[PDB]
Amino acid sequence: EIDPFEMAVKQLERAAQYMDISEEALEWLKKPMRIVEVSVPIEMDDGSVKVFTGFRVQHNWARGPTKGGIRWHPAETLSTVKALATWMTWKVAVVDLPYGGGKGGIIVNPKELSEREQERLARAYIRAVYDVIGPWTDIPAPDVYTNPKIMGWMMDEYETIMRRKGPAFGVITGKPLSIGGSLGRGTATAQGAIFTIREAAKALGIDLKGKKIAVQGYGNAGYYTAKLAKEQLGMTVVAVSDSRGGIYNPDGLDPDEVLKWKREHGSVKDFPGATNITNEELLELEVDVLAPAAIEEVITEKNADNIKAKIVAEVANGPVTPEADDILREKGILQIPDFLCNAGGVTVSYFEWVQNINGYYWTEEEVREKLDKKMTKAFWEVYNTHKDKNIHMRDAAYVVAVSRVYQAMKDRGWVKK
Numbered sequence: 001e002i003d004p005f006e007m008a009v010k011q012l013e014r015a016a017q018y019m020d021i022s023e024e025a026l027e028w029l030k031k032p033m034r035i036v037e038v039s040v041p042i043e044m045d046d047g048s049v050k051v052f053t054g055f056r057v058q059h060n061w062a063r064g065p066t067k068g069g070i071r072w073h074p075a076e077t078l079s080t081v082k083a084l085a086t087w088m089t090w091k092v093a094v095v096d097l098p099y100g101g102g103k104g105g106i107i108v109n110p111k112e113l114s115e116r117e118q119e120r121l122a123r124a125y126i127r128a129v130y131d132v133i134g135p136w137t138d139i140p141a142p143d144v145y146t147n148p149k150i151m152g153w154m155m156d157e158y159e160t161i162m163r164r165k166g167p168a169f170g171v172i173t174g175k176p177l178s179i180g181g182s183l184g185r186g187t188a189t190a191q192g193a194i195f196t197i198r199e200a201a202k203a204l205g206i207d208l209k210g211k212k213i214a215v216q217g218y219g220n221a222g223y224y225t226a227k228l229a230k231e232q233l234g235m236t237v238v239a240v241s242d243s244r245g246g247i248y249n250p251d252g253l254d255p256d257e258v259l260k261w262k263r264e265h266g267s268v269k270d271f272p273g274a275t276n277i278t279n280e281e282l283l284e285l286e287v288d289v290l291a292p293a294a295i296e297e298v299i300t301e302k303n304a305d306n307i308k309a310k311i312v313a314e315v316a317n318g319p320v321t322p323e324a325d326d327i328l329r330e331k332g333i334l335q336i337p338d339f340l341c342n343a344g345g346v347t348v349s350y351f352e353w354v355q356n357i358n359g360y361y362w363t364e365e366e367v368r369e370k371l372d373k374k375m376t377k378a379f380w381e382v383y384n385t386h387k388d389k390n391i392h393m394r395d396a397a398y399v400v401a402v403s404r405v406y407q408a409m410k411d412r413g414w415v416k417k
């Protein structure tokens with residue numbers, strides 16, 4: 001139940017309800033512009049040939065070449081890929097990139113595939129979808145169960161097929177630094193989230209120096225968010241959690257020590273000098289910034305009234321339900337929309353694509369400054385729409401993104417109204 005695509009269409013329809021958009025443009029936006037389903041045959045280590053199902057959905061390319069990652073998950077469906085491409089369209093539109101929306105995926109369990117089999121899978125996927133991808137057509141990226149090594153393999157296969165007739169480095173992002181990689185990719189999402197948190201604090205008029213932050217989820221995104229907050233913003237990290245449990249310390253925590261203790265003991269549980277807590281009561285501490293960077297849909301009707309965070313930074317992909325959205329807005333809580341808070345990753349991916357296209361590569365400082373400018377401008381545009389239209393922050397972000405895409409469509413002459 002609860003079809004993925006249908007939910008995206010519903011959301012797109014809730015967004016259009018707050019803005020003036022023609023019916024033909026909305027109907028165009030409700031349909032992906034191109035969907036490609038291909039068979040991906042690879043040779044297994046036992047010599048047998050197995051055929052996998054691969055997807056490549058390009059939702060819209062009015063603003064430019066489509067952008068989106070490739071997922072290798074056993075539960076991947078065409079509907080999920082279409083919904084994620086639709087969401088990626090708004091994600092690149094809100095942060096003002098010359099990109100469209102795209103997405104790819106292969107129905108495969110990568111846990112049971114060896115390195116050689118994974119390389120064969122990546123190369124065969126490239127051989128299957130070469131005709132619909134390119135540096136100026138469709139730029140894939142890392143995603144769940146996919147890493148930069150697979151990006152390098154895919155880029156090498158694309159370069160082999162294209163015969164080095166153009167910027168083969170720019171066809172795919174997230175590559176290793178040795179081959180067309182970009183500095184600052186590892187901490188892109190956390191850096192963008194930190195920039196949006198700083199801008200939100202500036203908007204609310206509060207100083208983050210010496211304040212408290214709780215991060216729910218301690219993956220790369222959560223750990224880097226906590227570390228960057230403590231370093232740059234000067235905030236005090238109070239509570240973190242893994243999939244198992246959480247810890248509490250009112251005097252503060254050192255993210256590096258927590259990470260060191262997490263990989264050593266396999267979990268964040270039972271950290272010395274800290275009190276063991278659960279995610280459900282961790283979301284309820286009185287803090288100024290709360291950053292859910294974990295399992296989706298963790299804030300609902302049950303716990304919406306108990307949130308005491310002044311700012312909620314949705315690092316994860318939609319951890320707050322729309323009814324919880326309304327409840328939090330009624331309480332005077334500033335929410336950064338999920339596809340705006342974690343837009344730093346796609347922005348750094350765009351920077352990598354620009355570097356590959358141009359043949360000139362930037363330093364860490366230049367990438368950080370450009371990311372700062374882009375994220376600050378996007379957040380301030382969203383907040384200004386919020387204030388002007390008297391709508392929710394998520395609604396304002398949807399309004400901005402759909403307005404940009406609609407203007408791009410009207411300029412091309414695709415829609416006459």
Ligand SMILES: NC(=O)C1=CN([C@@H]2O[C@H](COP(=O)(O)OP(=O)(O)OC[C@H]3O[C@@H](n4cnc5c(N)ncnc54)[C@H](OP(=O)(O)O)[C@@H]3O)[C@@H](O)[C@H]2O)C=CC1
Nearest residue numbers: 189217218219220221242243244293294295316317342345
């Ligand atoms: N990675 C990125 O570049 C960006 C990520 N996002 C979204 O953000 C989130 C984090 O990013 P990512 O680095 O990929 O995640 P990771 O795979 O690196 O880490 C996953 C983490 O969340 C924890 N977790 C899983 N389920 C729960 C749960 N039910 N309760 C509490 N903690 C849980 C895991 O715990 P444990 O350590 O015990 O396994 C782990 O700490 C994801 O949801 C992702 O989709 C979007 C923006 C870009």
Ligand SMILES: O=C(O)CCC(=O)C(=O)O
Nearest residue numbers: 067068069141345346349
């Ligand atoms: O870099 C990209 O194009 C996709 C990265 C991503 O998964 C994201 O930013 O949500």
